[PDB]
Design a protein around this ligand. Structure first.
Ligand SMILES: Nc1ncnc2c1ncn2[C@@H]1O[C@H](CSCC[C@H](N)C(=O)O)[C@@H](O)[C@H]1O
Lengths: 264, 265
């Protein structure tokens, strides 16, 4: 069979006990580290924890040849496929389960802490998050802007917007919340929808999963050049705040106490 | 001087992270709450045996009213663990406890674990397409909440999926089933008539996420409303329009009818 096992948010210990015990017993172990960055560990530390050699796959290996590289072995052995965070969150790995089934290979999923739910540490109510988006790096003359519309739609409904940030693993490029803010300000100048400006309140979460992640809230004008530490980072554009959310942002995320006076 | 909020994960005692288990084992005192949710695939005894030290369970009142008198005093001179189902602070009331810790001069750290909020990715539905979430609560006497119906309406109108947390009477271990949630939604439809939830609505049910063998089913209300989805917990999802890849996963992994490919995509 094939096991999709999440490794978690930051280091090798973010794997669930369930996932660790299953990985330890698999005959072959594959993994990908292009969908996210685990800033607090190394391939070696992960390999030593599970006691197995890990065959790292590239995006092309997975998207073009998963059925030729992984499935053949999964047909005669217990195989594990490890991924940062949760394997089925903000990835297309669910597609691999379809491929596995069509190949007659049984698959199982072992979850792990995900950034999608870890944002609860920002004090923003999880149920208030609306549609999510990804801020992608412009490439050549191609400049992605769809994420701007997502914020607009959510904000109109008073919902928070989670913005996954881009990652180019092969080039070791990890988009910072600062770069995301800069990009959003440029899109605002092109669309002028009054969606993201210097006065917009934002929240930054960096290195969730670590013991001391950076949790900061404030206006773009003040946070755009602030050092949030090493990647990975995620950016959030809150919608209409409840007083309790504002209180946490002020007390824990260092937000301006003025956000306490929620305009009703 | 340190308080650790540690997530227990989705279903059984092995759903805690290695980090959470190792930290709990080194704490002087271990507390836990089982009112925001429950760990259906295990027991207090099994969690306690895995950690190796006594776990003091706190009631909703103990936490909401007396967290600062029961937990924080000990955290002042010792390392204290506070275990919670799922991922800490997904439950909306968790966060404020960190402010109480701050007020008491106690450092607090969060050790994450899987949450049903993120585990729904196993339904094959794209995470980014989930909109606002809602909870379907059991009506009681003169209280018949229906806001969750409006949440589905607003999400679906924008092509977004709706995650519906189902009610859980923790103290009595009573879990609302997907069937009961569907029945309530049909009743709300009868009262609002917005054409939001009917026998022809496509729904997805995820039961016992975290287990190696969760029940993942998708189909129309008319066919699923009386289906046995197995033991708790259940959540219900009302998807918005589907990407063909989402529909294929529902058909091939969740047993959805082929009709969803020509009706819901
Ligand atoms: N520990 C962490 N801290 C902050 N952001 C994180 C993070 N882990 C992932 N992200 C964010 O999410 C993006 C990857 S998207 C893949 C997410 C993963 N499956 C999960 O379940 O978490 C990163 O580029 C970053 O923007």
């Amino acid at each position: 069979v094939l096991y999709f096992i999440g490794l978690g948010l930051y280091d090798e210990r973010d794997i669930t006990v369930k996932g660790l015990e299953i990985a330890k017993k698999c005959d072959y172990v594959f993994a990908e580290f292009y969908t996210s960055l685990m800033a607090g560990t190394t391939l070696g530390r992960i390999q030593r924890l599970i006691g197995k050699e890990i065959r790292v796959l590239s995006r092309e290996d997975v998207e073009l040849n998963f059925e030729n590289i992984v499935l053949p072995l999964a047909k005669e052995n217990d195989v594990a496929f490890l991924t940062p965070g949760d394997p089925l969150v903000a990835t297309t790995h669910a597609e691999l389960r379809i491929r596995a089934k069509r190949a007659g290979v049984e698959s199982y999923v072992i979850h792990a802490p995900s950034i999608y739910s870890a944002v609860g540490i920002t004090g923003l109510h999880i149920y208030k998050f609306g549609k999510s988006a990804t801020v992608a790096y412009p490439e050549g003359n191609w400049f992605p802007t769809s994420y701007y519309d997502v914020i607009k739609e959510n904000a109109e409904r008073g919902l928070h917007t989670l913005l996954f940030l881009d990652i180019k693993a092969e080039k070791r490029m990890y988009m910072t919340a600062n770069e995301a803010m800069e990009l959003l300000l440029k899109v605002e100048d092109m669309k002028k929808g009054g969606v993201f400006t210097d006065d917009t309140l934002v929240v930054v979460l960096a290195r969730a999963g670590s013991l001391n992640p950076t949790i900061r809230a404030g206006y773009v004008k003040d946070l755009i050049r602030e050092d949030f530490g090493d990647p990975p980072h995620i950016l959030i554009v809150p919608g209409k705040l409840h007083i309790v959310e504002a209180e946490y942002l002020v007390e824990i995320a260092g937000a301006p106490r003025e956000i306490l006076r929620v305009n009703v």
